[PDB]
Amino acid sequence: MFLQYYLNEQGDRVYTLKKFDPMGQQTCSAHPARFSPDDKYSRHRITIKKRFKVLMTQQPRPVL
Amino acid sequence: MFLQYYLNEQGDRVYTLKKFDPMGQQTCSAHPARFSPDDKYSRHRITIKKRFKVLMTQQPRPVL
Amino acid sequence: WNYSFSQLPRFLSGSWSEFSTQPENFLKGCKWAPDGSCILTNSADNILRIYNLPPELYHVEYAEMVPVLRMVEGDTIYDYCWYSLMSSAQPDTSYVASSSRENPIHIWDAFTGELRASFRAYNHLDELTAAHSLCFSPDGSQLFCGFNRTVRVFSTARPGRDCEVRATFAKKQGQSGIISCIAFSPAQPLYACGSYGRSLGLYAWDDGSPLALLGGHQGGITHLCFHPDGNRFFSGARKDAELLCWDLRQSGYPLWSLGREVTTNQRIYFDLDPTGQFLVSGSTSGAVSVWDTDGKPEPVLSFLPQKDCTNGVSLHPSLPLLATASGQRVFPEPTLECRLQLWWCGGA
Amino acid sequence: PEEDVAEIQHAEEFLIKPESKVAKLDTSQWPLLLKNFDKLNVRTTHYTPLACGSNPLKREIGDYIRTGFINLDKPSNPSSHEVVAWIRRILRVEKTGHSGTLDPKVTGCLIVCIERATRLVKSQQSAGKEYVGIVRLHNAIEGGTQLSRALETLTGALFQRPPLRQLRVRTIYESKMIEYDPERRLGIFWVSCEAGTYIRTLCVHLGLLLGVGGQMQELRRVRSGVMSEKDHMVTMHDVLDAQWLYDNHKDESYLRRVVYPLEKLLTSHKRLVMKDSAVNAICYGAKIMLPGVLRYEDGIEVNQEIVVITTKGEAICMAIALMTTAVISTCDHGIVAKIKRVIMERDTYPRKWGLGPKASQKKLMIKQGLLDKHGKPTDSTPATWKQEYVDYSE
Amino acid sequence: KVAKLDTSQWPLLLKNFDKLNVRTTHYTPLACGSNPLKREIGDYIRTGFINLDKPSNPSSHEVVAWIRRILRVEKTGHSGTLDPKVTGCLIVCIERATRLVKSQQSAGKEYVGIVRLHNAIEGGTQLSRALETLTGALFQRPPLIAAVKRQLRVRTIYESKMIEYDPERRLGIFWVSCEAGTYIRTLCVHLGLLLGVGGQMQELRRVRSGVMSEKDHMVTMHDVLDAQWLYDNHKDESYLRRVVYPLEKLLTSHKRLVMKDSAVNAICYGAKIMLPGVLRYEDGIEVNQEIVVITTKGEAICMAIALMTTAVISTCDHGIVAKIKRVIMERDTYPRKWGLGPKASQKKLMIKQ
Amino acid sequence: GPPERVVLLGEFLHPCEDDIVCKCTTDENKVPYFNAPVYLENKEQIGKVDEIFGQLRDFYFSVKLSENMKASSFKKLQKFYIDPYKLLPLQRFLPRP
Amino acid sequence: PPERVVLLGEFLHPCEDDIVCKCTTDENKVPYFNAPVYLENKEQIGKVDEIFGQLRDFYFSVKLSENMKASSFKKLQKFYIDPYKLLPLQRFLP
Amino acid sequence: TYQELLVNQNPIAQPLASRRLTRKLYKCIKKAVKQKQIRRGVKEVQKFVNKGEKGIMVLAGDTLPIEVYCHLPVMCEDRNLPYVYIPSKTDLGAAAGSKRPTCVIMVKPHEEYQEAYDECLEEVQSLPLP
Amino acid sequence: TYQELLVNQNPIAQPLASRRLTRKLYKCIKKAVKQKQIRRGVKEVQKFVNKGEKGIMVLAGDTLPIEVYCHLPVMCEDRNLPYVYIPSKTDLGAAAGSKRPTCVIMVKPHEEYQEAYDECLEEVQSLPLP
RNA sequence: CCUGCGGCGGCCGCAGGAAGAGGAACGGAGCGAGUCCCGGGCGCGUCCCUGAGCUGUGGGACGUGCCCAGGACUCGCUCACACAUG
């Protein structure tokens, strides 16, 4: 893959072909992580994502 | 019994086995004093609790 | 060889350096292995240590004794004993029982030093209760242990949760208090229980049925010994001066009384000859004293292993050695180091 | 001062006092189809609520999933069909669909409709979309100016062949070149699409028009109709983790973060609120007639597509408006809309047609024989009824 | 001086009253209520509850019996059974407050205990990870084996934490947030099994019952006895008024429905909660949700189950908003003023006429 | 008498105080009765089920060993087997639907 | 052999073995796929393979015959097709 | 060390013995224990104040929660017994030949130590009321 | 550069190896690759971690999206296998031998470099808990 | 005639309807009883105990007076039969 992005101040993706944003910090891979239907490792991800306060429930809720 | 505690700057409880808290004070037992319904020293307790300004009424009102 | 105190026992080296690792340590007693291979010592740091007979005895200033294992318990050890039928010829028999505060009865293997088995005893609320005394039956098949108004019998073949319960105090009648020590008779089905409620009881091994209940020490009873005579046995207590002698023939009253200084709430051990003739006791004054039981037991000797309480003694089953353990609780005033030692008690 | 404040609290008297002023609500932050619910035009308030349904967000977790959809970020290996099959197996639901087929390598927005929400799949599939993708030019060119010119030239209603075929026409609303690398000749474009537009074909045409030739290197869908990657987007890992957390901890929360109710998709549409008695009739396939209406929005126009909702904010059906907003306000009778797609399951709301005054009168007159057995007039019919009653089936 | 306050500072159920939705602003105030804090002392204690720090020796049943003998009242109930040796937070509801006890017994708990391990482990991290394994919905059996066979059941632990480990004594302090009915003794046993060394519960304290925690408003049995003594001897209410809180403090978390003054006694007699009576209603009222119905002075009339949502209440003009779950208030606290409204008067007239 | 056939019940984890802890492996996450016998692959009784503890999908159990059995005998990931009629479905512990 | 021909369009820059061409067909009618393309001399250069661009001014490309090379063709050169293959634009528009 | 112990005090901790008076009280307790003339623990001290036995009552100033012993000063003031607070319960246990702590000791008068006992009484009553 | 590398770290990337330990780990990886004792990539690493193999698992704190290696550090804790994060993807890749980046490797012991392996093992196990 | 579901962008089959959209007291409350899944603890008081035994902020002996599993589900008695007064 070659597609990379850095967020705006406005909070939305700006795609770029570079490995670094114009302020020098690393751009993220645009594509999601690989998945297979047979992950039994959901427990491990939930544990860690709780410990560092990054589980999706812990973020403030979206506007509905 | 083993549970001791000391107070955090919030005024919350930090539970310890240590007889001393990290700042050097003694820790309090987590458990309240033993009680009897036939206790007859209510007068005495109220008297010196008033005397040293530590009766419950003399504390600031709880916000509700 | 033989045991004979014609003179003061001779010093062979002990262990002093270990116990200093904890400030205000002391030894809670020592016991020879029933084959004489090694000696087990409890301590105020709750670590069961074990020393071999230094081969310097067979092979001058000895080396200081160092233990081969250190079986760490998590809380205060109430009792500990060698397996009744231990031998060096048979590896699997060589294990140690131990009882600790609010822990089960741990079994430790005496060669490797690992935890090997656990016996768990529970009250009516399904809560764990600790054993204040331990004893292996003289046939090795059972592990008797003491509790408050209760003796429970575990089977050594099935470690786990299963025990017979033998109530010793029944509808406020019988032997009360914490049963502090258990012993068996070399000949007879008797076993004898001492209690912190200052009392003795004799029971039937197969039943648990009371045979007698006997007069009091002026303090809680802490140790027992049967003579190689099935006929006669001895007992001691905490904060008593007197060490009492009993007999199964003409029972009901202690035949003789012997004097020793106990002024602490300590188990001051005493021990007999493997042939039964001599009786040796420690004391809080430090003075170890010896009687000849071959009439009233006749005083033989007193000597001072150290200038502190001698709380544990034990006599080697084959060989002339005496072992002593030392120390007591140090009391403060608000604002003398303990040791295991060995002695030769044979002829020159 | 909380010491002062608390002594005031115990000392002095509190009451919610009478006033003569008008009570005006603020519904601007009610959820989904209940937003600005007071600003609707009101026909009547006299009806009986039935307490049988739910507010869409606060549905029980069973019904929440069955009415729900996921704004998924598609992983790069599987096909969209295989993805929705995975999602069906994870949630243990029986039926699933999506808003459009991303060919396997492509990632991005895939609106995965679950169970009863799959009734919306056709409307989601027809919706306009946006893409980000890489074009790999086979030969060099004067620069990004030329690629931007090619993208401008292709911004229109276009001829397209599918990849291997027949000719088709799809429109591309707006195109920009994000950036271009002259070293590898990889350029990244953003295009807004009519649904069904082929981006591989567009890349080939960019190559042809430039003359260098080119391909699509990889592609990402950033928007699928109303949902964007900015907008509540969830990964496959989030779906699986959510279902696992719900099973093991019994914690509904993380599923309720991943799955949304279908009423979120309809939010753009104009609303028309029905009496609870009307709801199950519309679910069974009835016409949407004026006596049922309680509320209706501004700017409802003839043949416009509107969402027909209950008083709890649920969606009953998608519908085609026959009366303008002004006509709805003024008229005595008629059909305000007709069904296009019934969303709500039958017998969620109970069966209460034929119990009202006019319909009971007609129902009685059939038994009296004053109308034919088929309900249409006879010589026995009174002149008053035969004049006044307008049968919508003619 | 009340006008100085924000509505956010108004006490109990009137807190943030103006951020409720407003149906109407007109009614005729009757005189015969009070703010729950300003109840006359007998009434105050009959409606009140105590957030108690339970002592170590007695059972919770004994504790509540002692409370109802100290305060001269005839009914008491508690938040959840604490085993005799267990200390901590026990909500004790007095007289009319006993109507809320099933709500309290369902509520979530927090505990702080100590587990004694029967053999050594590598350190605190093993115990913490073993606590993580036992979070979620768990199989448990009640803590006695002496009764031959006991049924297995599922209990949920929401969070767990390890606060200290003492390798010398093999003691670890754990904090557990869990649902009511969870057996912590059994948790210690299973934690010991999971480490492989064995274990027991050494000691336990409950630090939260539902909405009440040990942090604030918690008092000792000595406070109850001494407050009753001070009231009897010197006729001073003040120290009782700090020991006992009104039951409205328990209901603060619930969604609110504010009634016209005429509707109150009708509800207390068992009438359903009609929409013409409603003055104000809270965002997020849902169908079949348990809500609290209050008077304009803040007094809880009843626990009601909502038969309308918030938007439905906004749209309609009459009908059942809610049905009674449990009536807190007594009859004729407010006078009978039903049957006097316009439509009901029409119906009365036309039945006679 | 021994049962007719037996189904996979668990893998062997650490011993615990002359008693053995097992991870439970059952095909529908079926849950055993208390004191149900536990067998080897030989349909040979090693003990009985004492404790059940775990997360409802993902749970453990403990075995009280037989009169002559001994915890040292077993090896990590060794399998144990149970009479299928002694199992209960996981649905039975979930609430009234 | 071709019966009769009419205009397709006008030359534009070449592509990979292919010619890209601007269609200027009368009233913007559209060719078939595989439609043979002829010169002014009525000799076949190849056949149409791609049709692209926006509807009114749309382009196309030709798969050239093995006898021809893209280098031969010239600016403002026109290309031809039999009118019986041309399709009316209103088949696609609505 | 007196300062560190001073940090540990209760709210009711006054009147608090001077450092030298604290040493005097400890040594007097030591002498009285050798004579078997103290009562210690709230249970004994309370019981024998009820029976009316005289003495000096020494209280640990670091005892929490206060409600275990805080009734005792009024029990003394009713009978006009002398009482005083000392900085720690561990020292109060230590002076009584104990390794465990205790929060109250009553020192009864007896012949051998009485000169020091009368000195202790003399200073304890000299103490300012709070 | 290390200060700049701390800007790029993902939310779960702790405990993070200190700069000295980071250089030490690079050196240890470079020794271990020469004996073919490293694993690399999440697929291989997790396969052999399931198989029962042990070592030090080194993780790149740069990794986004996190979901790929997130299951690894709890999977370590279940097996009591040590793990540590280091501040870049590219240097971890380079030390492993990959010219392209890598997000996880597993350095295993061998007799040649085990002095440095024991340095890494003890220093990593003696890192603070987050 | 309308809707829903399935099968190859229209058709075919099967299933549910034929819908004008009712009801400003419906059918409640409070209290009590019945049917299904006390041997001890605690409190107090004639003497011991800093036990290495929990323990003096309390443990024991001998005396002596307050506490007794929750949840389903049915209906007898009292009071109403309530749309809440611009």
Residue numbers in the entry:
A (entry chain F), B (entry chain J): 1 to 64
C (entry chain K): 146 to 204, 209 to 443, 449 to 489, 510 to 522
D (entry chain C): 23 to 186, 192 to 421
E (entry chain G): 43 to 395
F (entry chain H): 65 to 161
G (entry chain D): 66 to 159
H (entry chain I), I (entry chain E): 23 to 152
Study text:
We resolved two different conformations of the thumb loop of the 3’ dyskerin subunit. In State 2, the thumb loop is rotated away from hTR, towards the 3’ GAR1 subunit (State 2, d). This is accompanied by an outward movement of the hTR P7 duplex and a rotameric switch of F98 of the 3’ GAR1 hydrophobic surface. hTR moves out of the 3’ dyskerin active site. Interestingly, the thumb loop in our open state adopts a significantly less open conformation compared to the archaeal counterpart. To understand this difference, we compared our open state structure with the reported yeast Cbf5-Nop10-Gar1 ternary complex. In both structures, we observe that the eukaryote-specific helix 1 of GAR1 blocks the thumb loop from adopting an archaeal-like open conformation. The two states resemble the substrate loading and the product-release state of archaeal H/ACA RNP. Our structures illuminate features that are specific to the eukaryotic H/ACA pseudouridylation system, namely: the interactions between the eukaryotic specific helix 1 of GAR1 and the thumb loop; and the subtle differences between the open and closed conformation of the thumb loop compared to archaeal H/ACA RNPs.
